[PDB]
Amino acid sequence: YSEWITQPNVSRTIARELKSFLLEYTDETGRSVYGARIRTLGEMNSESLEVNYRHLAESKAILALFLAKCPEEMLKIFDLVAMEATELHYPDYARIH
Amino acid sequence: MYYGISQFSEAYNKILRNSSSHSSCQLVIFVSCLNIDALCATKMLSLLFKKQLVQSQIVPIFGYSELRRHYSQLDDNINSLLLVGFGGVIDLEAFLEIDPQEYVIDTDSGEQSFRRDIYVLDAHRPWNLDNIFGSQIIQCFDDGTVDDTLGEQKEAYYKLLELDRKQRKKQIHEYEGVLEEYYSQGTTVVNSISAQIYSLLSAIGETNLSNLWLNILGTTSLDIAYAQVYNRLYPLLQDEVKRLTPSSRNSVKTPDTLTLNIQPDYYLFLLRHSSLYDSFYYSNYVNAKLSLWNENGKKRLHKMFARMGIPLSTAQETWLYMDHSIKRELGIIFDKNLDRYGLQDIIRDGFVRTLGYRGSISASEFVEALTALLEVGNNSAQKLTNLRKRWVSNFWLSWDALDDRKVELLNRGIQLAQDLQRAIFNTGVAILEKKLIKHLRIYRLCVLQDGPDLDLYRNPLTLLRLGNWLIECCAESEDKQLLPMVLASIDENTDTYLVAGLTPRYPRGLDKKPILNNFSMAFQQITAETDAKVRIDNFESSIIEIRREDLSPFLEKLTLSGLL
Incomplete structure (x- = not known):
């Protein structure tokens, strides 16, 4: 998995999938839960985004698998995806963290 | 004539x-x-x-x-x-x-x-x-x-x-x-x-x-x-x-140069003398656009600073010590971002004075300092008179602060203005959270019975700060009808209410012929008709005093009055 996750075409595909998880996943009630987390992230000027592993096991579950198998490469992508997911909402949040 | x-x-x-x-x-x-x-x-x-x-x-x-x-x-x-x-x-x-x-x-x-x-x-x-x-x-x-x-x-x-x-x-x-x-x-x-x-x-x-x-x-x-x-x-x-x-431009700054420029003077509270955060938090106009008393309004404020790209830890720095890049970029940050919130009207040109090396003050910021000196710079006939003596005594604090030799007294004023606007705000939220503004068809009523540091509001000017804050707040809401407002506050020592009649006004950017304060007649005409005890002696004759038990009979005949 270490060698798979680091190949450039694979890395790009993983990023887009993780992006699409945060953008398109919605709660049992129908609210965008990761929109509500990103609001709270940028208002608090918090540097840390909580993600629930069950929300990956319930959608795009290969990402939940790679995340358990080799997190040191997977989180290294999902930190950049979370930066871009919050920067869609708060342009220039890069000047804050 | x-x-x-x-x-x-x-x-x-x-x-x-x-x-x-x-x-x-x-x-x-x-x-x-x-x-x-x-x-x-x-x-x-x-x-x-x-x-x-x-x-x-x-x-x-x-x-x-x-x-x-x-x-x-x-x-x-x-x-x-x-x-x-x-x-x-x-x-x-x-x-x-x-x-x-x-x-x-x-x-x-x-x-x-x-x-x-x-x-x-x-x-x-x-x-x-x-x-x-x-x-x-x-x-x-x-x-x-x-x-x-x-x-x-x-x-x-x-x-x-x-x-x-x-x-x-x-x-x-x-x-x-x-x-x-x-x-x-x-x-x-x-x-x-x-x-x-x-x-x-x-x-x-x-x-x-x-x-x-x-x-x-x-x-x-x-x-x-x-x-x-x-x-x-x-x-x-x-x-x-x-x-x-x-004549001179591209002039070198020297201890002797007074410059009185026309330049951007944002419609914010004591900007050059406070943080960039307190500037928005305590502004009448900002509070009115963001509904900033309740905590969703405070979220809208942080969400704006985050979107402008200013850290809260920077926005809260005292404006002198806030960094050189933000303070010159700020005109571009506001011209990009304020429009999203409707705050576009905060951009304004005003008069800014700087003397020597002692750092600029705008005409807006200077009158906030001078009013704060009038307001708090220091047997009922003695209890009134030893209070009216205090308000005559404060006039000479505001007077002496107009002198350039006495900047330490202006700097007292600029600290007092930030103590007052905080107390106005902490009272104005109490009114809006507790729903104390009652709608009486002809006018809106508000009556402060009890509260923290309520003994400020016995000065006619401090009652008018809270009046102008509640008016801006109402005047921007698009559903409310514009109605005259009556704002009353008790003095527990004299046992009177100070009552102020306030005109509404149009939202700060809309552009009509003026509207007029007819409480000045309605209070006289109801006073002449009643046997109640009042004072109608103030120069701004929209403001009166009335003994505690006479107030409800007075308001009861104010709602009947065809003069409003």
Whole structure:
């Protein structure tokens, strides 16, 4: 998995999938839960985004698998995806963290 | 009419002729304290009489009861009076108990002269006709109102004064009908008293940057409540700053350079003297657009700073120590972002003074400091009088803070203004959270029964800070009908409520003919009808005091009143 996750075409595909998880996943009630987390992230000027592993096991579950198998490469992508997911909402949040 | 704008030099030369001698003090200026425009007017007018060596006395006055007391005890050698900021709307000849026959001298010839002149420098309307036409001792100054607006009242006044049956019935009730429509107009301020005295300094040829700064300060104090008047006068102030500013540009800063620029002066609370966060949090206008009392409004504020790209930890730095890149980029950050929140109107150009190396103050920030000095700078007849003495004593703190030698007293003021606006806000949220504004169809009622540091709101100005905060808050909400508002606050020691009647106003960017404060009639007419105990003695006659148990009977007859 270490060698798979680091190949450039694979890395790009993983990023887009993780992006699409945060953008398109919605709660049992129908609210965008990761929109509500990103609001709270940028208002608090918090540097840390909580993600629930069950929300990956319930959608795009290969990402939940790679995340358990080799997190040191997977989180290294999902930190950049979370930066871009919050920067869609708060342009220039890069000047804050 | 009485002294039009064309002929202020004649009224001034008449003061010099009558009241200049090296022998004695002969000139008295009565100034309404609790008015910044009357303060800045009287400061200019004292620097003028200093330069002419006219020996003079300035007496600050709280209200009409003290005007009668101080007038009653004037030494008979005093032969000119200036009434700065009051008395245009009362019959001064009746109120002061003048009979001109006890004042007339040298009656010969189609002629009179008098042992005293009473010059009224006042911006309030509707003018009392027995001052403007009906007296030779009282001598009003005008912006132009009388010739432009009063021609039908002039004619009606004289045809009724001459006429001491069909041909009579047909006419006496036409002319009384014109006066009866002229009264039954609400109160308004239509000019700054300082721009009147600056136009007198322009007639004498005395203008300089010190008198121009006092003109800018006096006129800026109107912007909160009479925005329609500030916008008439603002174009005329821009021209005078250009006229008096010296030739040099790309100038080196030196301890001696005063610069009085026209530059961006954002509509924010004490920006240069506070953080960038407190500037938004305590601004009347911002609070009104974001609904910033409740915690979702506070989220909208953080969500804005995050979107502007300013860390909260930077936004909360004191503006001097906040970093050099943000402070020059800020014009671009606001021109990009404020539009999203509708805050676009915060962008404004204003007057900014900097002296030497001591760092800039805007005219907006300086009047916030000067008002905070009037408000908090330091057996019921003793309990009132030892309080009104305090408000006369505070006038000299605001006065001394107009001097450049006394910046430490301005810096007291700039700290006190931030203590007040925090207390206004912490009270204004209590009113909106606890739903204390009751809708009474004809008007909105608010009554502060109890609360933290409630003993501030017994000063008429501090009650008007909270009034102007609750008005901005309502005036921007698109669903509310515009209605007059009554704001009452208890003093637990005197056992009265201080009651203020407030005009609503249009939202701060919309661009109509003015609306007028008719509580000044409704309170008098209900007072005359009732046996209740009240005080109707304040110069801003929208403000009254009433004993605790009489208030509910008073409001009960206010809702019936057709005068609002």
